[PDB]
Structure 1
């Protein structure tokens, strides 16, 4: 099936815990895959304007590891719960993608999660101003804008609202799209 196909593809890129013990400042993100109308979508947040770190940007759910987290996956799930109300039984963490190095002293670990069909996001307004879905296929033929430096623009056909997606967030979205959708019969 579509969801089993996705999982089996994603597993071939799983690095596991290989890089998880290194002495970095640690941050995790969740890449939430949602099935809707026969197709895969990714879920994104718009960060609250009132935050000190990264106000108003399009990001995946995530945040800084804390002493309670058993591992880097736990960080990603804790933060998704706090931001959009995603509960543990509503998500299956399928793999850990390549981590991103930043600022010489920081390591960001991405996990891909399959989201239960009865989940409905409850944006927490102290953390997140908006939550929206983008079809995974979009990231193979995106609408690109040069700020000269590449930014994606996505317009939701439901309401005509446009979102800007860039940086690490846009890089990871393209990666997941290639993994899952490259070389498939139609």
Structure 2
């Protein structure tokens, strides 16, 4: 099936806990995969304009590890619940992708999660101004604008354009390559 095939592909890139104990300032993100209309999509947030760090930017759900978290995956799931109302029974964490090193002292660990078909986002306006889907296939043929490369995605439902860039854009392309490369039509 589409979903079994995606999970099987993703598992080949799982680093698991290999980098998880290193003494960094630790953050996790969830890359949430949603199946709609026979195709996979990624779920993105737009950060609230009132936040200190990166107001109004397109990001994945996530945030800083706290003492309650059993592991890095728990961080991602806790933050996703707080930001968009995703409950743990509504997500299957499939794998942990290559971490992202920044600022010399920070390690961001991305987890890919398959999202239940009955989940409906409830954006928390203290954290997130918007939540939206992009088809995974978009990231194979994006609309690129240079400012460094920025992706512009226009939602055909409403005509709204979102700008996706940096780590977030790079991770989206990675997931699209992993799942969609070399597939019969």
**Residue segments in structure 1 that go unaligned for 5+ positions in a row:** none
In the superposition, the TM-score normalised over structure 2's length comes to 1.00
Matching of residues 76-115 of structure 1 within 5 Å: 76-115=76-115
Runs ≥4 residues deviating over 2 A? none
In the superposition, the TM-score normalised over structure 1's length comes to 0.99
Q: In the TM superposition, what is the alpha-carbon distance from 1:168 to its structure 2 partner? A: 0.1
Q: In the TM superposition, what is the alpha-carbon distance from 1:103 to its structure 2 partner? A: 0.5
Secondary structure class of the residue paired with 1:117: coil
Q: In the TM superposition, what is the alpha-carbon distance from 1:150 to its structure 2 partner? A: 0.2
Secondary structure class of the residue paired with 1:76: helix
Secondary structure class of the residue paired with 2:79: helix
Distance 2:11 2:158 in 1: 35
Q: Does residue 119 of structure 1 match 2:123?
A: no
Q: What CA deviation, in whole Å up to 9, does each residue of 1:110-132 have, x standing for no partner? A: 00000000000000000000000
Distance 1:126 1:47 in 2: 9
Distance 1:39 1:144 in 2: 22
Matching of residues 126-137 of structure 1 within 5 Å: 126-137=126-137
Distance 1:55 1:95 in 2: 28
Q: In the TM superposition, what is the alpha-carbon distance from 1:88 to its structure 2 partner? A: 0.4
Q: Does residue 184 of structure 1 match 2:179?
A: no
Q: What CA deviation, in whole Å up to 9, does each residue of 1:81-128 have, x standing for no partner? A: 000000000000000000000000000000000000000000000000
Q: In the TM superposition, what is the alpha-carbon distance from 1:54 to its structure 2 partner? A: 1.0
Distance 1:51 1:157 in 2: 28
Q: In the TM superposition, what is the alpha-carbon distance from 1:170 to its structure 2 partner? A: 0.1
**Residue segments in structure 2 that go unaligned for 5+ positions in a row:** none
Q: In the TM superposition, what is the alpha-carbon distance from 1:53 to its structure 2 partner? A: 1.1
Q: In the TM superposition, what is the alpha-carbon distance from 1:24 to its structure 2 partner? A: 0.2
Distance 2:142 2:54 in 1: 24
Q: What CA deviation, in whole Å up to 9, does each residue of 1:118-172 have, x standing for no partner? A: 000000000000000000000000000000x100000000000000000000000
Distance 1:183 1:137 in 2: 13
Distance 1:14 1:127 in 2: 29
Distance 2:106 2:124 in 1: 26
Q: Does residue 32 of structure 1 match 2:52?
A: no
| RMSD value, Cα | 0.2
Distance 2:52 2:141 in 1: 33
Aligned length: 185
